[PDB]
Scaffold this active site. Structure first.
Site, PDB file in Angstrom:
ATOM      1  N   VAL A  57       0.911  -0.992  -0.050  1.00  0.00           N
ATOM      2  CA  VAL A  57       0.145   0.022   0.071  1.00  0.00           C
ATOM      3  C   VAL A  57       1.135   1.125  -0.064  1.00  0.00           C
ATOM      4  CG1 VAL A  57      -1.659   1.234   1.344  1.00  0.00           C
ATOM      5  CG2 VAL A  57      -1.857  -1.086   1.313  1.00  0.00           C
ATOM      6  N   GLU A  58       1.034   1.931  -1.273  1.00  0.00           N
ATOM      7  CA  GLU A  58       2.259   3.010  -1.255  1.00  0.00           C
ATOM      8  C   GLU A  58       1.217   4.440  -0.980  1.00  0.00           C
ATOM      9  OE1 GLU A  58       5.068   2.820  -4.004  1.00  0.00           O
ATOM     10  OE2 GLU A  58       4.507   0.815  -4.866  1.00  0.00           O
ATOM     11  N   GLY A  59       1.997   5.111  -0.195  1.00  0.00           N
ATOM     12  CA  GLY A  59       1.455   6.544   0.101  1.00  0.00           C
ATOM     13  C   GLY A  59       0.790   6.470   1.357  1.00  0.00           C
TER      14      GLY A  59
END
Ligand SMILES: Cc1cc2nc3c(=O)[nH]c(=O)nc-3n(C[C@H](O)[C@H](O)[C@H](O)COP(=O)(O)OP(=O)(O)OC[C@H]3O[C@@H](n4cnc5c(N)ncnc54)[C@H](O)[C@@H]3O)c2cc1C
Ligand SMILES: Cc1cc2nc3c(=O)[nH]c(=O)nc-3n(C[C@H](O)[C@H](O)[C@H](O)COP(=O)(O)OP(=O)(O)OC[C@H]3O[C@@H](n4cnc5c(N)ncnc54)[C@H](O)[C@@H]3O)c2cc1C
Ligand SMILES: *[C@@H]1O[C@H](CO)[C@@H](O[C@@H]2O[C@H](CO)[C@@H](O)[C@H](O)[C@H]2NC(C)=O)[C@H](O)[C@H]1NC(C)=O
Ligand SMILES: *[C@@H]1O[C@H](CO)[C@@H](O[C@@H]2O[C@H](CO)[C@@H](O)[C@H](O)[C@H]2NC(C)=O)[C@H](O)[C@H]1NC(C)=O
Ligand SMILES: NCCCCCCCCN
Ligand SMILES: NCCCCCCCCN
EC number: 1.5.3.14
Lengths: 462, 459
Positions: A57-59
């Site tokens: 899960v990026e950000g």
């Protein structure tokens, strides 16, 4: 209105969810494979479920909340861990054994980082049309004042780590204006969290689907007849009055609109025939954008011979051959005691590697590992997994990348609907192309445009 | 007016000659090395002189005469031979032994040619502003309907011979609009002639220079004090009234104008400091254009083990690693009985190889040759010559290449003067960037621009 949605990956499931919410429940979701989730998909490797596709899960932790995070971290509680890249400088291996001096590496990293920040300032000033865009490489030359970008082994693997490892294509082909800085990080936060749960990151998709499709009370399997798996759409016919969709097993369905969520690579391969043919402006937009390939090569060993501990999760191999087995991750937290390593390659190396045997790839990797850990008895891997996304006709790559040469208007043509045919998918996200959250949001956005046409009779696009 | 010309390569000598012809003879040519010619330069290898830089006159037999041809073919009569690529299909080597079936390969070549031809039609319809330009790779995806361009080893090597062997960078970085089709061949003809003369291709530059610089009557050597070798310019100061140029050995010179002919690579490097700094528009145009690298690796063997004969001159190695020692040439006509082979590499491989020793490179090449000729007893090469153009601070590369993203207007800014600082060189050629004929015409055009401004005040 009846709506057919092609594909049950994140964007299709997300689009169908939003239509359902607007009261459009006469839906038919046609999925090529025997399962939903698409590019979010796990697999058993040597006794553990690892992710063949999306893994992070990026950000996270920034000014706005990435919509995927709460589902992962709270609604479902998927096991996960924050990635820390702060110790890379202590973990860059020499082509010929042992690691480089930390201070030397930290300085190259700081230079690279400074160039990029100067690049963010330039980018902010470029004309919004994209007409003055340039590659990340041109920006690097400008700021380092050299006729080339990073070119020694250490600087090159640092460059790969900074760019290719995120975009899956080199800086020289990548749009500066659309990736430096990246909205995902600017809006949602600089952190990333690696999902490592037996249920898989795809659980997020099954969760959303379950909010509106019917499921079995004991198994919880979705049983809604509105979802049909093993249905490969091969042709979409559309007219002023409606659309007709045909699958490979000869089924034929009709609807008022169709929403296409297949990847950019599928669209570039002609798996789906459109009748009439899509307009030239649309076709050109489809071919100019890039479908990248990111290959997660997992390896299983009889014993461990690499370091574990603080700052050891991520390590790099400074090959004199750019991008050659360069970015490594060890799983002391995610898969403790499994003795697994993950090396990531992309682009040219991915294409070469998908085209040869796993045994050959394993032997190339063993020579690299023995050069990196000369003092250990490095045992041959007993198992290896090479995901072949570019070869899979339902994907033809892993995620889009915005190249130098595609401008803002051209990108909008890529997303634009054609008559009753709408498009969605990560490649249609204006600010988050490539990501799971971009797929999620693009599904809601495309559905809304369709809702306006269908419910408010507002059918003109831009 | 007094004019200083930085560099004695083709464009510098050409510009100085044109100026001399307009009567501007108070010139001072400052060259960094101990000789003139720059990128046109020969060397002795295996007791023969081979070209480290340019080697072909390209674009011959067409509707317009390539200005360099007559000088090479008639005036000096340098020894040369037309290159024939018609038999490539019989000469593509499999990664692990022998050549591929000729018909299979010929069809792959045809398909590649056909796609490029559609690319030429498309290119003709794009807008001059460059707003619809795309990389050559993008055109290949569009014309073949695939998410990727050539990707099997054989398709890749054919792709490499058709584009990288000419441009020195991959199609995915290259501007379609500005390279397909290419003016050089469209205007001057499809043939190319390989120069193999002991005097060297550089003789063309020496001839032009002797048309106006003084040479000794016995020797023929240039002795004109307007030419000064071993002068490395390191600083160029300019004002609305004139310029001052400083050299590494500490000389300092003054003039009304300076004409800079150093390569785009040198300008991207900072070897020369401008004071004041060049304006931003200038700096951006400089860094956006590409300076490519093409490395001609020569090898000498104790005996021949490769084929010789009709169609054998050029051969490809189809490695699964794109661009790995892929384009070969043998010189049965050029250097009969010499046992020399030439393998060419570019871009990433060039920078990797320049950074390792010759022995390491030789060893890598011996492994490829052994894989190519499994039936033979392949002797190790006794000598190898690896040119290091990118590492050489006076060149920093071999020739410019036009990348996707740069339009004609920005390319034109490369040519633009800054006050009294003028620029010339192959990267400023309007339609022939990258070639010897382009360096030649660029010197003339740059000089005329300065003549009109300086002499007629029409700037
Ligand atoms: C190796 C890899 C690594 C990645 N890493 C990350 C990461 O860590 N973090 C992140 O945020 N993102 C990452 N991504 C990107 C992320 O997975 C995607 O952005 C997102 O999952 C795409 O969802 P989508 O609905 O746009 O496309 P898809 O998931 O491709 O959904 C499309 C669906 O259509 C189906 N389909 C295709 N053709 C047809 C047809 N003709 N008829 C019917 N059905 C059809 C496909 O099976 C699929 O189910 C990665 C992806 C990959 C593959
Ligand atoms: C390996 C290779 C293969 C090529 N193949 C061919 C071919 O087969 N056919 C073809 O048509 N073209 C080919 N080319 C391209 C062609 O050689 C060039 O376009 C042309 O010679 C460039 O001339 P120029 O005057 O622009 O630059 P140069 O020849 O670079 O002249 C610039 C001069 O400035 C000098 N200089 C640099 N810095 C300074 C300084 N600070 N102070 C003073 N002097 C300085 C240099 O020493 C040099 O003499 C090839 C080039 C190379 C290198
Ligand atoms: C991820 O989710 C976990 C699950 O709750 C979060 O940990 C909780 O955070 C609240 C906020 O103060 C605490 O009161 C709980 O005690 C925490 N639980 C545990 C087990 O520590 C966590 O903060 C979330 N991480 C992110 C980055 O959002
Ligand atoms: C290059 O120069 C040679 C040198 O003459 C050309 O060959 C001559 O051309 C004339 C023209 O009719 C003939 O009468 C001579 O007999 C030719 N000499 C030889 C040795 O054949 C040649 O055609 C030129 N090539 C190009 C491409 O211009
Ligand atoms: N670390 C893997 C990231 C994969 C997500 C694709 C985003 C890149 C496109 N902007
Ligand atoms: N085959 C060698 C060609 C060298 C000349 C450079 C031209 C490439 C840029 N148009």
């Amino acid at each position: 209105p009846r709506v057919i949605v092609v594909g049950a990956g994140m964007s299709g499931i997300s689009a169908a969810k939003r239509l359902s919410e607007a009261g459009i429940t006469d839906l038919l979701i046609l999925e090529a494979t025997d399962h939903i989730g698409g590019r979010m998909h796990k697999t058993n490797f040597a006794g553990i479920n690892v992710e063949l596709g999306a893994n992070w899960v990026e950000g996270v932790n920034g000014g706005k909340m990435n919509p995927i995070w709460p589902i992962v971290n709270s609604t479902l509680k998927l096991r996960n861990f924050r990635s820390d890249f702060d110790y890379l400088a202590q973990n860059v291996y020499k082509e010929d054994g042992g690691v480089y001096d930390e201070d030397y590496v930290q300085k190259r990293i700081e230079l690279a980082d400074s160039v990029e920040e100067m690049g963010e300032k330039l980018s902010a000033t470029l004309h919004a049309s994209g007409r003055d865009d340039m590659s990340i490489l041109a920006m690097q030359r400008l700021n380092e004042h050299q006729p080339n970008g990073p070119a020694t082994p250490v600087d090159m693997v640092v460059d790969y780590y900074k760019f290719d490892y995120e975009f899956a294509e080199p800086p020289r082909v990548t749009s500066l204006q659309n990736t430096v800085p990246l909205a995902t990080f600017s809006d949602f936060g600089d952190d990333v969290y690696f999902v490592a749960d037996q249920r898989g990151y795809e659980a997020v998709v099954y969760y959303l689907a379950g909010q509106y499709l019917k499921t079995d009370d004991k198994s919880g399997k979705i049983v809604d007849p509105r979802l049909q798996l093993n249905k490969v759409v091969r042709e979409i016919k559309y007219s002023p009055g409606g659309v007709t969709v045909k699958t490979e097993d000869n089924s034929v369905y009709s609807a008022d609109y169709v929403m296409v969520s297949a990847s950019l690579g599928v669209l570039q391969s002609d798996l789906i025939q459109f009748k009439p043919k899509l307009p030239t402006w649309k076709v050109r937009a489809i071919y100019q954008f890039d479908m990248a390939v990111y290959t997660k090569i997992f390896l299983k060993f009889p014993r461990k011979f690499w370091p574990e501990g603080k700052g050891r999760e991520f390590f790099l191999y400074a090959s004199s051959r750019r991008g050659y087995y360069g970015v490594w991750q060890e799983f002391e937290k995610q898969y403790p005691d499994a003795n697994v390593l993950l090396v990531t390659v992309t682009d040219e190396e991915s294409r070469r590697i998908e085209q040869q045997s796993d045994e050959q790839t394993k032997a190339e990797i063993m020579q690299v590992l023995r050069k990196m850990f000369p003092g250990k008895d490095v045992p041959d891997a007993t198992d290896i997994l090479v995901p072949r996304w570019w070869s899979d006709r339902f994907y033809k790559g892993t995620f889009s990348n915005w190249p130098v040469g595609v401008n803002r208007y051209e990108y909008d043509q890529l997303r634009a609907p054609v008559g009753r045919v709408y498009f969605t998918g990560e490649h249609t996200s204006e600010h988050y192309n490539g990501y799971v959250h971009g797929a999620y949001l693009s599904g809601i956005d495309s559905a809304e445009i369709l809702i306006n046409c269908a419910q408010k009779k507002m059918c003109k696009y831009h």
